[PDB]
Amino acid sequence: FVTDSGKLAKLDELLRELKEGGHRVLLYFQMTRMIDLMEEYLTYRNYKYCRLDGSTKLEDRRDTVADFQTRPEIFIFLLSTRAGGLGINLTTADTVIFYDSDWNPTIDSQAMDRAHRLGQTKQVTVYRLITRGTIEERIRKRALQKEEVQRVVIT
Amino acid sequence: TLMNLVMQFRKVCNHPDLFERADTSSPFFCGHFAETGSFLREGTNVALGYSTRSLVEYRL
Amino acid sequence: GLNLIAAHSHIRGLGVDADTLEPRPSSQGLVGQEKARKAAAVVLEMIKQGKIAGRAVLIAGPPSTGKTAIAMGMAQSLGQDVPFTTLAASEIFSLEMSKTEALTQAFRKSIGVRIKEESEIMEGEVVEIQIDRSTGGAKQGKLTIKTTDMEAIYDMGSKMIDAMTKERVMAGDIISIDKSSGKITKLGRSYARSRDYDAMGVDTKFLQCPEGELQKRKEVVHTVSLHEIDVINSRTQGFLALFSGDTGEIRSEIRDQINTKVAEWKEEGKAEIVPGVLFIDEVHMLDIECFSYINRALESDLAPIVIMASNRGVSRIRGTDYKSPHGLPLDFLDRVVIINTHPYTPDELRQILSIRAQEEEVDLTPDALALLTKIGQEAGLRYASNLITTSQLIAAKRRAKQVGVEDVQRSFKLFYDPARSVRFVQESEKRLIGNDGVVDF
Amino acid sequence: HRTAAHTHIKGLGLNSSGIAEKQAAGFVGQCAAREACGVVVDLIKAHKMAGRGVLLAGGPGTGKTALALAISQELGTKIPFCPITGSEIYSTEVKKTEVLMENFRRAIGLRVRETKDVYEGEVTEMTPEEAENPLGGYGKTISTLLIGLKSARGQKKLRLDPSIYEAIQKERVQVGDVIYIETNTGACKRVGRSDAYATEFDLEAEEYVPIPKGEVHKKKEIVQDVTLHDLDVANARPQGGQDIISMMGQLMKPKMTEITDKLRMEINKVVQKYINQGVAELIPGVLFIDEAHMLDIECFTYLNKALESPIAPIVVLASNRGIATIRGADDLKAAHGIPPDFLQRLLIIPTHPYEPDEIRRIVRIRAQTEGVQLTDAAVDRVAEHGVRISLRYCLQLLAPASILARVNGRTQVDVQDIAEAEELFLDARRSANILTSTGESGGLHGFIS
DNA sequence: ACATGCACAGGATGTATATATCTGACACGTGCCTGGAGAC
DNA sequence: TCTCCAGGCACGTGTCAGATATATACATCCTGTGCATGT
Numbered sequence A: 001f002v003t004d005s006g007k008l009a010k011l012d013e014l015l016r017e018l019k020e021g022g023h024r025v026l027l028y029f030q031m032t033r034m035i036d037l038m039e040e041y042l043t044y045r046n047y048k049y050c051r052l053d054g055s056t057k058l059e060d061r062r063d064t065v066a067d068f069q070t071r072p073e074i075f076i077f078l079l080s081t082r083a084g085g086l087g088i089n090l091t092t093a094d095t096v097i098f099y100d101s102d103w104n105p106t107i108d109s110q111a112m113d114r115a116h117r118l119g120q121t122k123q124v125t126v127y128r129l130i131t132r133g134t135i136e137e138r139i140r141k142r143a144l145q146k147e148e149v150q151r152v153v154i155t
Numbered sequence B: 001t002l003m004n005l006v007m008q009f010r011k012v013c014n015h016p017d018l019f020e021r022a023d024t025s026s027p028f029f030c031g032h033f034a035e036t037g038s039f040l041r042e043g044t045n046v047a048l049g050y051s052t053r054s055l056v057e058y059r060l
Numbered sequence C: 001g002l003n004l005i006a007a008h009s010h011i012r013g014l015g016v017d018a019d020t021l022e023p024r025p026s027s028q029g030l031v032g033q034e035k036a037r038k039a040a041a042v043v044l045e046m047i048k049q050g051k052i053a054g055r056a057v058l059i060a061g062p063p064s065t066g067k068t069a070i071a072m073g074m075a076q077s078l079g080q081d082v083p084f085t086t087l088a089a090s091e092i093f094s095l096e097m098s099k100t101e102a103l104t105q106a107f108r109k110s111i112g113v114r115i116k117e118e119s120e121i122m123e124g125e126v127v128e129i130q131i132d133r134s135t136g137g138a139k140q141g142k143l144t145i146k147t148t149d150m151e152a153i154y155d156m157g158s159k160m161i162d163a164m165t166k167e168r169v170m171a172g173d174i175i176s177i178d179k180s181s182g183k184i185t186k187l188g189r190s191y192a193r194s195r196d197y198d199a200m201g202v203d204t205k206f207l208q209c210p211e212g213e214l215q216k217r218k219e220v221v222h223t224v225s226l227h228e229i230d231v232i233n234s235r236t237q238g239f240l241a242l243f244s245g246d247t248g249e250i251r252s253e254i255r256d257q258i259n260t261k262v263a264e265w266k267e268e269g270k271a272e273i274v275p276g277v278l279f280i281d282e283v284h285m286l287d288i289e290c291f292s293y294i295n296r297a298l299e300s301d302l303a304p305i306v307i308m309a310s311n312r313g314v315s316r317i318r319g320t321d322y323k324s325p326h327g328l329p330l331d332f333l334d335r336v337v338i339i340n341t342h343p344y345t346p347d348e349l350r351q352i353l354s355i356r357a358q359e360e361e362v363d364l365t366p367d368a369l370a371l372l373t374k375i376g377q378e379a380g381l382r383y384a385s386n387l388i389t390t391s392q393l394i395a396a397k398r399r400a401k402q403v404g405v406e407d408v409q410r411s412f413k414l415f416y417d418p419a420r421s422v423r424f425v426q427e428s429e430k431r432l433i434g435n436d437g438v439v440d441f
Numbered sequence D: 001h002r003t004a005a006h007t008h009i010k011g012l013g014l015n016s017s018g019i020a021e022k023q024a025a026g027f028v029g030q031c032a033a034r035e036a037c038g039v040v041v042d043l044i045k046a047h048k049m050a051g052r053g054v055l056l057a058g059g060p061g062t063g064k065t066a067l068a069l070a071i072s073q074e075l076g077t078k079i080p081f082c083p084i085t086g087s088e089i090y091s092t093e094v095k096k097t098e099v100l101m102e103n104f105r106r107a108i109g110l111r112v113r114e115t116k117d118v119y120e121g122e123v124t125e126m127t128p129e130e131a132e133n134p135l136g137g138y139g140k141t142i143s144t145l146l147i148g149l150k151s152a153r154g155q156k157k158l159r160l161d162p163s164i165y166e167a168i169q170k171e172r173v174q175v176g177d178v179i180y181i182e183t184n185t186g187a188c189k190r191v192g193r194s195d196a197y198a199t200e201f202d203l204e205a206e207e208y209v210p211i212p213k214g215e216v217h218k219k220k221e222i223v224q225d226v227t228l229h230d231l232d233v234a235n236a237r238p239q240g241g242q243d244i245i246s247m248m249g250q251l252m253k254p255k256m257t258e259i260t261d262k263l264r265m266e267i268n269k270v271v272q273k274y275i276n277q278g279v280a281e282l283i284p285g286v287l288f289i290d291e292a293h294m295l296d297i298e299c300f301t302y303l304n305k306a307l308e309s310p311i312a313p314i315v316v317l318a319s320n321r322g323i324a325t326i327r328g329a330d331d332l333k334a335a336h337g338i339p340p341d342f343l344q345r346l347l348i349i350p351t352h353p354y355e356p357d358e359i360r361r362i363v364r365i366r367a368q369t370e371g372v373q374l375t376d377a378a379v380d381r382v383a384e385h386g387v388r389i390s391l392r393y394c395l396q397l398l399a400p401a402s403i404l405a406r407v408n409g410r411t412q413v414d415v416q417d418i419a420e421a422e423e424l425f426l427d428a429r430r431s432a433n434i435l436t437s438t439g440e441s442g443g444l445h446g447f448i449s
Numbered sequence E: 001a002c003a004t005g006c007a008c009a010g011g012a013t014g015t016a017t018a019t020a021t022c023t024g025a026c027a028c029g030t031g032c033c034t035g036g037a038g039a040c
Numbered sequence F: 001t002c003t004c005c006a007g008g009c010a011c012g013t014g015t016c017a018g019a020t021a022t023a024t025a026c027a028t029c030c031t032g033t034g035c036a037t038g039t
Ligand SMILES: Nc1ncnc2c1ncn2[C@@H]1O[C@H](COP(=O)(O)OP(=O)(O)O)[C@@H](O)[C@H]1O
Pocket: C007, C008, C029, C030, C031, C032, C033, C062, C063, C064, C065, C066, C067, C068, C069, C070, C352, C355, C381, C382
């Protein structure tokens, strides 16, 4: 499993280093089916995690987010990128990773704002795993473009 | 053949098991077991029976 | 489905008349051979008589003159009643056991015992099952079944409820409770409860309810040879040996005691002995150590009739160095009685090719059939019978319907008959490895 | 990624009308053999075959087995192809006719759908319930259990036989181990500790898996590719079930045994019962017996009855012999080593030697296949060696001449590198000439004659 | 000169991933009291 | 007839199967209509 996906194989290396550093990760996905696959992987490598996606009921949301923030044993939070509005605070996490990018820049921007916010203390680092030679690079361009239009007009 | 190929592409890059995952298979079985009829009858307290016989029979 | 067209899938019996023993020239596949088929008819009618020992008939003749054809005709003209056993004579030279004993087992495989005894079975759709497992256990329960006619309730013993949860009998199964043992063979599923089956495939067969009474007696007839009983009475659970060949040298006192109990079964009327046929194909591949045992295994009361086929002329006997007719020693040729065959006239060649064409369902123009008969005059039956299957496919290359001269002349062009292959070897000596030399251009 | 002797062959290279076009898909020339091999391939893919004999004659070094790999890459992956030799069947456990029939039933395949019935749960309560056990020597005996499986949606509390309990017991299933009782045999593989008992302070190196989602009584269908010889071995030495013959039969050493006629007929009737239920599909194949002249007369006797069967794969024999003596009986000589009675079954395909330009094309294809580029004068030199010495000698003078080229800083192979490799590495003919000339007398500096 | 047939314009429809909302019917918990059950 | 209590009734509640739009992208089907060709 971990080698049949190039991203997953590279995420493994990165999570081992992050763990040994004592970093805490929000890890963002654009597909909840993948959220499931991963859920497995994390069980294998025996890391503690939470989950919040569009299936996660509202008071359960409150509960999970509060955990991640209360109890530092949890290393990864698996978050669906569009799920959860503005105003979930995860500033105990110091690392964000995007397993896959959105076509819309702002949705990834709003996602990393969950770490980078008032009351954050440590320096947030944002990984972005890109599969070279595939649609993922297309996406990344098309999104940097869009961000150029935002930069030109709303300045 | 698949419809939304940009969606299909992203799935591949994520993990091939999004498509067709494997799962503890097993070797082929030649004998004659007993198939369960339905799921909605034997509710909670059921008993398994060793029903394994060979299809090769020898009649004496 | 496992009925692929072989080189003898057109023979549906010996084809001769059974009233005046006349070999009518074209019936059931065997076409043309007359005197040999009448002699095989006489041998066949004295096999079903039973009042003769194990004798020996040698089907001698040239290659591809219909010897395995006559043997397969006698095999099809007996049904699954009298045990016919084929034996190509190189299955004897084994390493699990000796060689004379491997021959003895092939004699014992062709003497059947036919006994007929009754059982009591139950048909019918299960209407419902209630089992009083309440902590309780398999103690009591009710079984309601029906046919189209009957309907009944039975109460069950503990050693029947443990067979009902063993086969998992649903409400709607078509089961066969053998009453004397307790096994349950589900014959299928009833159609009328097609909604009540969720854990089945989308494509699933369904039967109807069984017709008639629900409690009937069957007169099944079993037939097992003496080698079956020998291998059964050889180990603890030894019948697996005759499915895995791991039987060894069976001691002879077991065979003697079983030869005694079969006679005691016959004299009490409990049994009946059926002498079978043993066909030793290619009998020239036996050494003299075999013939010095076949000369005495054809002496006892319990000996099947041996039919055997030889190709060789004056050839050597294996094991020894001196030559003999048919590859057989003369003290054994005193035992056998020889049927000689003949080569085939061209019209018989034409209608044998016609039968082989109608068997594979290949359309032929009569010009192509004339050309194919002309080829078979010069290259034998096997070459033309393969040119048929090749020419159908070559006609299917260029999308044709009937084969013609333009496809038989291609099959004759690509695939050499063995005479031109011998000419090819004789005219390409220096590159083909004769014994010593390899020359590379 | 290893260039073997047969790597450039990618198929027969036939047109739509079945006409062989030369220098296509690996081969060079060889028309009358490749058209006949295409006819053989479409004879295989039409299923009107129950034993046909196809002989591949021709001298050594003319590409008899190149046609065989062309056939095996033209049929496809899902058709059985069993290549053997003539020396492979002389065994020490069984008679060689058993090895012939085992290859004949390796060459017949079957594609079967199966419905496995797993019970995939997490063990909650494991409690044995022994029965009455009077004075009979062995003592008590566990006869009934109460194992509770707990999946994600709806638990179940089931009761077991003694044999499935022994299947559990030889797997060391504690409380917490997820398992998957297979109710076809009875086998049950422990997967690991459930993640509800997870602790990073652990030492057993267990594999923690989550609770299996879905119903605890699943039912899944798969497709399986099984040959008839696999069924023969399965019913011969049993290794499935939970009784004693099928458990003490997998601790012994495995031995090839003589699967008799009765098992080979009963498995045919079982497979016909599968086909009549609309489940299994039969796909016959090829037995390629290379070097058929090594088979002795006791094997060509048995091939007659092995091909008279209503189900028998097509045989493709290869034999690079002229008029030779059969191995079994040393007093009748025949063509190819095949006996003159067995030879009439065969549809004999000839194979002719090559030409001084076809050798040049084969050298060019082999050089661009291995990855050795070179000049045209060097190609002419290697073709000159190919005409004079042998075909598969001059192909082998490309692998040192690359390395020697890389010695001298070159990339392409020139005349000097082949002119040096023809002196370092010799053929058989000049070596035998040196042998006869120098080895005049036996002694200190002689050869053992 | 008129009619019919064949391809541009660019729009509406469509495919696929979870998100963000929602609604009403079913199931379950609570409280209580009267009438179904006891038995002489 | 004197006696008891639990089954059932009224009342909340809570949740989730099928349904309402959709950001994120793009290919595709559709057919009004214009132009060209043929009669
Ligand atoms: N009388 C016949 N009728 C039909 N086919 C025949 C007859 N005689 C021979 N054949 C055919 O000729 C072929 C050779 O017969 P066979 O007995 O196999 O030759 P051999 O005796 O050399 O084994 C067989 O395939 C069979 O189909």
